[PDB]
Each structure stands twice: as C-alpha cells, then as structure tokens.
Amino acid sequence: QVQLQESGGGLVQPGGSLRLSCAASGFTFSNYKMNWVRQAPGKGLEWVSDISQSGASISYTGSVKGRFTISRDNAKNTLYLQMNSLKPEDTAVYYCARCPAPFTRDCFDVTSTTYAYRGQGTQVTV
Amino acid sequence: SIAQARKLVEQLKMEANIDRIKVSKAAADLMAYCEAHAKEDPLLTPVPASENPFR
Amino acid sequence: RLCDVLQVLWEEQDQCLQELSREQTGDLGTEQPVPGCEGMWDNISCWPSSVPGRMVEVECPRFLRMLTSRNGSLFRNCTQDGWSETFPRPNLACGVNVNDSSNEKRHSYLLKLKVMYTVGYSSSLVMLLVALGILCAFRRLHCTRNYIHMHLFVSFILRALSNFIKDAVLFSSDDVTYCDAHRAGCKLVMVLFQYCIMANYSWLLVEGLYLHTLLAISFFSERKYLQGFVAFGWGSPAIFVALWAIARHFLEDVGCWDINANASIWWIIRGPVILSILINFILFINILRILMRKLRTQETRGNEVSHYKRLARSTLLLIPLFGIHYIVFAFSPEDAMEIQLFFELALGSFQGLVVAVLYCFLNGEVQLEVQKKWQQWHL
Amino acid sequence: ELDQLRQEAEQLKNQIRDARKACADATLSQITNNIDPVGRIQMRTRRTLRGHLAKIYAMHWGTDSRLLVSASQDGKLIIWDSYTTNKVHAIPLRSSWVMTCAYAPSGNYVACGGLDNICSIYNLKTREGNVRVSRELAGHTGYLSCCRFLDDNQIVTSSGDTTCALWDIETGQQTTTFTGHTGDVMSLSLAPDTRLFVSGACDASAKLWDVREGMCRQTFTGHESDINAICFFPNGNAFATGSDDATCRLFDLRADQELMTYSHDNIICGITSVSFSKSGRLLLAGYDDFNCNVWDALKADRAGVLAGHDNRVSCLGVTDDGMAVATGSWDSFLKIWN
Amino acid sequence: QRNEEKAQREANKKIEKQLQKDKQVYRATHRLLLLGAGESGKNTIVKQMRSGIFETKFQVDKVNFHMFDVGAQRDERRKWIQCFNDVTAIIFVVASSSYNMVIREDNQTNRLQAALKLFDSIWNNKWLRDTSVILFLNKQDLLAEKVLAGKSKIEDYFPEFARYTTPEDATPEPGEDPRVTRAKYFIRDEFLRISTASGDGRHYCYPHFTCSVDTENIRRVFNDCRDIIQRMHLRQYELL
Amino acid sequence: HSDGTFTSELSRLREGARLQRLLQGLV
C-alpha cells in the first residue's frame, strides 16, 4: 500500500522558519521523483518544489526561490522541505506528492484534485 | 472528506469482516488445479503439427 | 569503312572474275610488256590484263582512290621479257605505308579504361544485388523512399549488365564478329545499351525530383504520383532511344550503330542526358538551401562549425544519389575526352556501389532490421 | 470529525493488515519449490495480421477461438479469421480514439469505446447482413478503458471517471454503478462463473466486485504504481495484475493477499497486458519494451519471451481452447503465437 | 467446403479494397491535439477556426487538418494523453498574462508556472518524445496592458526577470514598448529553456505570440505542420 | 554520355586498325 505522511507543519511568526518532513512507505523511494505541492485557503493546489531520484536535479517555484530548500534521504525514505523567511502568502496545506511512474523524466497530475499518490497534507500558518 | 471518510470507514469494516484461508491451502489448490489440467494445456504441452490448426 | 572498301575490292575482284576467262593463253610466250597473264586479283587490287599494260588503272581501292593523291601510274607485268611489276610501296603506296603511330596510345588508353570500368560495374553489380535483396526481403524497410531506391538500383544493374553484353558483342575479338553476321542483333544490343545508360540517368533525376517535391511542395506526400515518377524513369529514355534508332535506321545507317558519325543524331541521346544532369544539379542546390534554412533556425545561435559539418555530410550523401559528378565534365571541350572518359567511366562505374552502401549498408534502419533478424538466429 | 474517521480508517487498515498476516503461514514459492520447473518455452509466430493503419489498442478472442476482434486508433474495428488471416468484417468507428474492444460469448455482438466516453455495441448478424451500431451506452463521464459482455443483454465497462457500471443493452441504462476506485479504472476481468469481476485502477489497488450486489467484497494492494492489466486465474479463485512498476503480482481471493510476485532486475518498464494459459501454469505479460514475457505462474520463473513487435505491446489474449496466444502492438500488427 | 473458403477470400478482398481508400484519406489528413487551460483562450481560438472529445475540421490551401480538444475528461492526463502520440503537432495554448495570483483563473497563484510544468511533462514523456509542440503564447493583448500599468510585477513570481535582458532578435511590433518586449520574450524564453534541454532532434517547439482573435493562428499552424513534415522527410533520408 | 563516347572511340580505332592490317595484307 503506497503511503505518504507529512509532518512538521504548524503556526509560525512572519519571518519564521519551519521544516516539513514526509515519511514514505509501500514503494521503492529511490526510483521516484518527489514533489512538494500546497493548497492555500480558497485556492487550488500549486506546485512548490521537485527533487530528482538522485537529488541532483532540484527545481522550485519562483515565489519560494532562495527561501525554501528541498532534500531527500533515500535510506530513510524521507522527503524534507526547509522553509525560511516565511510570509503570510505561504499559509497553506503542504502535501508531499510522488510522481506516478518510476524511472520517468516527466511527472504528471501531482497537483490534480484527487491524485492517488499524494499524502493527507500538513497545514502551515504564518 | 467527512462524507468520503464516513464512506471509506464503512467499506473497511466490511473488508475486515471477511473469513480468510491459510496461504498454504490457497497455494496447494492452485498447484492441484494446474497439475490436473497440464495435459489439456496446448501451450504447456505442445501438440503435433498435425493437431495444430495454425501449423 | 573496312567493309565498304573490302567489298569494293571484292567487287573489283568479281570484275576481275568476269574477265577471268580471258582466253589470252599462248601469247605469254612471245615477249610482251604485258601478255594478259595478270591473275593476282588478290595481290593487285585487280588485274587490268590490258595488252599494252602501261599502268594498272585500279591502283588503290575505289573508296581509297579519291584519298590516294595519284590515280594508277603503276604497271604490274608478269613477263619473262617485258615491263617489270611495280608494287604499291614502290608506286604511291597510298597512305597505309605511313606508320600512323599517332592515336596508338589512345587505342591502349581505352583498353585499360575498359578493364577499370569492368571492375567498377562488377563491384557495383555484386553490392547492388545484395542491397536490392535486403530492401525487398524486409517488409519494415518497404516505403516510397525504398521503392524509388529499388528502381534506381535496378537501373544501375542494367547499366552494368548492358556494358558487359555490348563489350562481348563488339570488342570480344579482333576478327569482326557481327561484321555482317547478326547486324540486326548488333544493332539491337546497341539499342539496349543506349536505353540502359539513359534509364540510369533518368532514375538519378527522379531521385532528385522526389526529394525536391517532398521538401519544396507543402504536404506533397500523396504517394499517388509514385507511378508517374516510375513511368518517367523508364518511359522517357525509351522515347529518346527510339527517336535515335529511327534516325540511325533512316539516316547514317552505316554498319552497326556503335560509331556516332552524325553529331546531330547523337544529340537525341546526349542532349536529354545533359539536361537531366543540369536539372539534378539545380534541385540538389535548392535542397541544400532548404536544409541550411532548417540548420540555421535550430541549435538556437548554434555553432557555424557544427552547421557546416551537418551541411558537408548531407551534401556528400546527395552527390552519389543524384549523379552531381556528371556536372564536372558536362559542357567540357573534346580535348578533355581522356580525363572525362576516365572520371565518368573508370571512377563513375563505382557509383552503383557507393549509392548502395550509403542508402542500405550504412542506412540506420537497414542496420537495425538486419541486426534484429540476426539476433533471432543468434538466440 | 474528519480526523476521528481518518484514525478509525487507519485502525481498520492495520486490523486488516494483521488479520492477513495471520494467514501468511507459508509462501506459494515454498509450496511450489519441489515441483519440476517448466523450462524454456519456445513459441513461434504462426500468423501476422496486417491491415490496421495506426496503433492497435485492444483485441478480444471469440469463444470459438477461430475468430478475434482487434481495435485500432485509425478508427477501425477489424474481425479476423485466425486460421486463414481473412478479414470477416471491417467496422468504421464514429470516434477514432477507441481504447477497448470486446467479443460476446455468443459472438452475435461486439463492443468498442474510448475517449468518446461511450460503449458502442455492434450487431454482427443483422437481417440485412450489414454490421450496424445497435446500442450506444452514454452514462460514463470519462474515457472507456475496458469492457466485457456477461451475455448478449448485459455488459460491464470501466471508465477514466474512476467507476465501473453494469449495463442492460436493451434499455441502455446502468443497472448498477461501482464507484470504489479513486483513480482512472484501467482494466477488468470477469470470473468464469461471471458472478464476480476484478478491476485495476490508477490507485495501485485492485477491487473484487459482486456483479448482482454492486458491492466491493475485497480490495487488494501492494502495487507501487498504476495497474494497467488484470486477468482471473482459470479456476476463478486467483487473479494476476500488471502495473507501471514493471512487476506482475498474483492475488488469491480466499487468502485476500498476493501469493506470488513476478519481477526481474533487467525489466524497468511497465506492463500493458496479462493473460493465463488454459491450465494457469503460464502467465503471459505484454511490456512497453515491445516484448511479451512468459512466466511460470507457480514458480515465478521467466519460461520464455515472445519478441516480434517493433512497438509497445498493447494487448494479449489466449484462445479459449488454449491452442494460441494473440498479441497486438502500436506497430499496427497482430501476431498469433502457438 | 470450398464454397465457404472462396466466399471468405472474396469478402477479404472487398474489405482490402475499402481499406486502401481509407489509407489514402487517413494518410492525407493532419491530426492536431489542442491543449489549454480554461483561461488560456483555447476555446476562443477553437471558435475562430470553427462529446467526450471535441473535433474541429478545417482546411488550409487544399490541406485537411483534424483538431481534437479534450471535452469531458478528468484533470488526470497520464493515461489519456498517450493516445495522441501520432498527432502531427500538439498546439499548447498558454495565457501569457497569468503570472500573478488570480482567484478567477483556476484559483491559482501562478497559472503560467502550472502551464510551464504541464509543458515540461509533455515534452519529456516517453510516448510524446517524437511529437512536436506548437506553443501559443495567447493573451498578449492583456499582457501589454498589465506590463504598461505596472501594478503587478513579473519579477515577484519570476525573480530571474530582474536580470533578464531582451535578446538581439527582439523583432518588436510597430509602436511596441521595450517593457512589453522584455516581458513576452522572458515568457517565451521560459518555455524555450525546457524544449532546448531535451529535444535531441526527435521533436521541435514552435513559439508564437498569439491572440485569441488573431486570423494568423490558422496560417501559423499550417506553416508549423509544413516545417514538421519537412524535417520528418529530411530525417528519413538521414540529411537531418 | 561517356559510355557511348567510349564505345564510338574504341570502335572507330579498332576499325582503323582492322583496315590498316587489311592494307598491310594487300601491299
């Protein structure tokens, strides 16, 4: 059974720092590109960051660049998002999302409503 | 969703209430079935060219 | 003409054979300038047998009589007592005596080129028969690019086969085979030789036309005009050779049709072939300009060097498939016939092998399909 | 609350996971370790069916096993006589994006559907003698992924709308609707009795459905990615599944957990299709690498490889008699292997 | 019975004659997939050219083009998009002015970033690797209004824009401001970065600054499909 | 074409040789 459980979210002051962790089970974590997506209240899911299977290739959305860091540990099966210089616009539910298929360059549907391979999320408030 | 969660829980209760069998019994039955029909399997048991409609 | 002259001499000998029953026997004893004993119709052009025998009127053969500066002035007398026989070398000797050393080297140069072209056509034929089979054998390879290629390969095989048959019929022996034997057969093989050469030129142009239409004409992939291209490839040479044959039979019908004495009649074959070479050169240049436009609007800024290597590789692949090498000596002076015969025939004979290697042996798809089938054998 | 239901669902999930682990006394591999291995299996390409202009998406064998219907994205449905290679019928389709096709057990009717979101039924035995669409089923909100006739009047379908639905062909209306899956349903397979059916979706889960009841009796998990294919074992008590994770798993119904796993380090491509041989000893799987792997179902060994396609193998079918296997590919060709 | 065998042989030949006609009409037609978000302007572009999948038939100078729009399908495209692996080109329509946070457009903080992710997933898909994309940067009229007004700054959602300089091939429109040119060219350069990274010559990207009412949209697609067919014939001959 | 020119040139020469041998025979 594919399971992704987020943790580390909570209430922070503007300018504060959080570290979100996603624990993964039920699949080979190293074979899949991982993503962090977020749903701000009254808004649709938005892509925040992605990390390649090795961790070598990393991408971020323009709004969070230079304030957010994405890291993965293959042995721990864990995905991490370090959020620094947090702003009120960063208030959202954060969901770590696995890409659908392994070994594939493309990643589709991670921000889609009702995506199977996505965790229940962790609300972050600034 | 609260309606969806109240729907998923009710389904899990039904799946938990099923009666199972030992994997050894399940695996013995598959083996017995395969061994009962091995002669009748033309792919496991190739047949003469004369019998083959294809060749 | 060896045959016209030989006959003139045979006609002069039949003229001699008419007077053979001279009935002058018995006056050969009394001393005379000539007693009419002359009977060397073979040794002389013919024996006049005139009693005075002051000169032999025939002298050199009637066809060569105009060429020879003098007429007669030579007396041959078979007399114990009388005038003394005079031989041609002593009298005039025509011009045969002239060594005529000039052009002996050219006679040898052509014989050497024939061996070089024989190996070029043979090598091409062996590699083109193994290329036509690979393309025909695999269904995956079948496409309208392959079918056009298939007809080109066959046109080369006929060009290569025609030459070998022509050489055997005309140059096999020093004695003239087909001198009067099977003249209609020597002419028929010449007609096939002319058609097979022109068919290869027509197919080289069709290769240019198809690729040019694929690129220049927007969405030109009907696959319906393929029969029209096939009809042009075989039909257009047939019309030109037939008009040459009509003229060769109607006019300049001298011996076998091998020698092109009439320049105007030759232009019925040479002119269409030259035009095919000019057209294929222009299409080849236009295909390269279209290709560079694709090269320049790609790789972004790209690299001048990288674009030129793509251009150089694509130009080199096209030259064998269109026959662009025929442009170098087309419109050349007749003083560079020795270099042109060498470039077009000695090295040109190998163009059927180069085409086959580039578009089959080195074609990536062919390499993939041969490999996959060999893996099944390898299993 | 939503959290109380969530922790309650997690409680039930762990309870099911303990109950199923209490039945794992011995693996199917250990039980079958002492039987003779199948050994190398060599199947030659007897018939190659040519005529489709675009990629084949689906194929179904007739019950007689002498005929087969293929479905292609050139907008054509083709009926073939596998014994002569003769085409019996070529059916032009209203929508070119067909993703599935089905032959009726009677063989009187066939069915196709795709991105149109419609299951179209064609009659093959009209009084006029011309194949005509006889019923269009329009309820589904997403593409048609798979269909199978229970009989001439009943047919089950699966959609990208996350649901399956029994249909009454005469009324054109859904008798019952199965909505358990959360991802696009990709495949279904009817049990030999036809009382139950299994379905594979893009949620890495397979569901067992009671046709008359419309309820999901059992759910089976363990695939890492989307389930692309599913097929029942010929006795009706187990089924096999093929996923995008380059793995095939055999799931037992009474045991409620997968007995066997078919995988190899060299295979890193998803599976498109799975079928069993008549005895069930052999599991055939189509791959994205253009090759079909024949597996020993009992020992999870690769017995043989079918390698004759130049494009992704889209669908596989074994004849009812068990004499032949058909394979359909994106290369526009169907190959029959003995 | 030989009577059954000769009948089946005749039936097969009647079908083969019909399939030869079908091949001529199928191979002569160019199939297009139109992809776009709700607020891309694809629907207006479709309306100008003019069902679980919608189809539009239009012709350009004797050449038939068949265009397909999704219609009623779920937002998950990983399975359905594989069906369009044989289309001539995928016309992706992107609203250029959707870089800021807008509740109206899908309630999305960045619609352009979502369009960039979709484009990168389509360009890098194994099945779509040989399929060329015609990028339609639609809604350029609105982008000029937003960039000239200056209330919402692209650099807020695209920090690289602050260091961005308009290239030497800017080819600005008559009377166009430098600010609009730098904006639209940055928008185009974002997509070009994805396409240049993995194209490998198998497929090509054709960017175009478009508007929903532009009459040139049909001619642009014709020219792109003509260049795609040319490159596909060049590749077969190995001329590239 | 070159093949026709080559065949015309070698036939014309062979004949000028076959005529020269014939004159060598007669004289």
Q: Is E85 on the interface with D (CB under 8 A)?
A: yes
The pair of structure tokens assigned to D6 is 């969530």
Residues of chain F with Cβ-Cβ distance to C259 below 8 Å are: 8, 11-12, 15
CA-to-CA distance for C208 and C212, rounded, in angstroms?
6
Residue D224 and residue A116: Cβ atoms within 8 Å?
Answer: no
Burial C116-134 (b: 16+ CB within 10 A, else e): ebeebbeebbebbeebbeb
CA-to-CA distance for D31 and D34, rounded, in angstroms?
7
Q: Is B5 on the interface with D (CB under 8 A)?
A: yes
CA dihedral for D62, D66, D71, D76, sign (positive or negative):
negative
- What is the per-residue DSSP string for D245-312? TS-EEEEETTT-SEEEEE--TT--S-EEEEEE-SSS-EEEEEETTS-EEEEETTTTEEEEEE---SS-
**Three-class secondary structure of residue D59 per DSSP:** strand
Order across the sheet with D325-329: list the strands. D45-49, D334-337, D325-329, D313-318
CA-to-CA distance for D65 and D57, rounded, in angstroms?
20
Relative orientation angle of helices C183-216 and C144-171, to the nearest 10 degrees:
160
**Full domain range(s) for residue F24:** 1-27
Residues of chain F with Cβ-Cβ distance to C45 below 8 Å are: 26
Q: Answer yes or no: are the C-beta atoms of F11 and C111 closer than 8 Å.
A: no
Beta bridge partners of E238: none
Q: Is C224 on the interface with E (CB under 8 A)?
A: yes
Choose from E108, E119, E129, E193 for mutation: most chain A CBs within 10 A.
E108
* Residue in C with minimal Cα distance to F12: C259
Instruction: Quote the minimal CA–CA distance from F15 to chain C in Å.
Output: 7
Choose from A35, A36, A49, A63 for mutation: most chain E CBs within 10 A.
A63
Q: Answer yes or no: are the C-beta atoms of D297 and D281 closer than 8 Å.
A: yes
Instruction: Quote the minimal CA–CA distance from D169 to chain A in Å.
Output: 32
Residue E86 and residue D54: Cβ atoms within 8 Å?
Answer: yes
Q: Is E18 on the interface with D (CB under 8 A)?
A: yes
CA contacts within 13 A on the Cβ side of A76: 9
Residues of chain E with Cβ-Cβ distance to A115 below 8 Å are: 76
Provide CB contacts within 8 A for C78, sequence distance 6+. C28, C34, C35, C37, C38, C39, C85
Q: Which fold, C104-378? A: Rhopdopsin 7-helix transmembrane proteins (1.20.1070)
* C40-43 contact pairs (CB < 8 A, 24+): C40/C76, C41/C12, C41/C13, C41/C16, C41/C17, C42/C13, C43/F26
Provide CB contacts within 8 A for B8, sequence distance 6+. D5, D9
CA-to-CA distance for E27 and D175, rounded, in angstroms?
42
Domain regions of chain C by residue span: 104-378
Nearest to D204 among A31, A114, A116 (CB): A116
Residue type, E148: L
Residue D55 and residue E78: Cβ atoms within 8 Å?
Answer: no
In chain D, the number of structural domains is 1
Beta bridge partners of D241: D230, D249
Asked if chain E contacts chain A via 3 or more Cβ pairs within 8 Å, the reply is yes
Burial D132-148 (b: 16+ CB within 10 A, else e): eeebebebbebbbbbbb
The pair of structure tokens assigned to F20 is 């020269």
CA-to-CA distance for D116 and D114, rounded, in angstroms?
5
DSSP state of C85: P
The pair of structure tokens assigned to C344 is 């077009």
Bridge pairing between strands D67-72 and D76-81? antiparallel
Within 10 angstroms of residue D219's Cβ, the number of other Cβ atoms is 19
Q: Quickly tell me which residue has 């002239």 as its tokens.
A: C98
Instruction: Quote the minimal CA–CA distance from C99 to chain E in Å.
Output: 57
Bridge pairing between strands D132-137 and D227-232? unpaired
* Residue in E with minimal Cα distance to C300: E196
CA-to-CA distance for A48 and A42, rounded, in angstroms?
17
Burial D50-74 (b: 16+ CB within 10 A, else e): ebbebbbbbbbbbeebbbbbbbbbb
How long a stretch of residues is chain C?
379
Instruction: Quote the minimal CA–CA distance from F19 to chain C in Å.
Output: 5
Angle formed at CA C376 by CA C370 and CA C379, multiple of 5 degrees = 130
Residue D255 and residue B26: Cβ atoms within 8 Å?
Answer: yes
In chain F, the number of structural domains is 1
The pair of structure tokens assigned to D140 is 């589904």
Q: How was this structure determined?
A: cryo-EM
Residue A107 and residue E81: Cβ atoms within 8 Å?
Answer: no
What domains appear along chain E, each with residue ranges and CATH number? Answer: 32-235 (3.40.50.300)
Q: Answer yes or no: are the C-beta atoms of C341 and C329 closer than 8 Å.
A: no
CA-to-CA distance for D201 and C352, rounded, in angstroms?
57
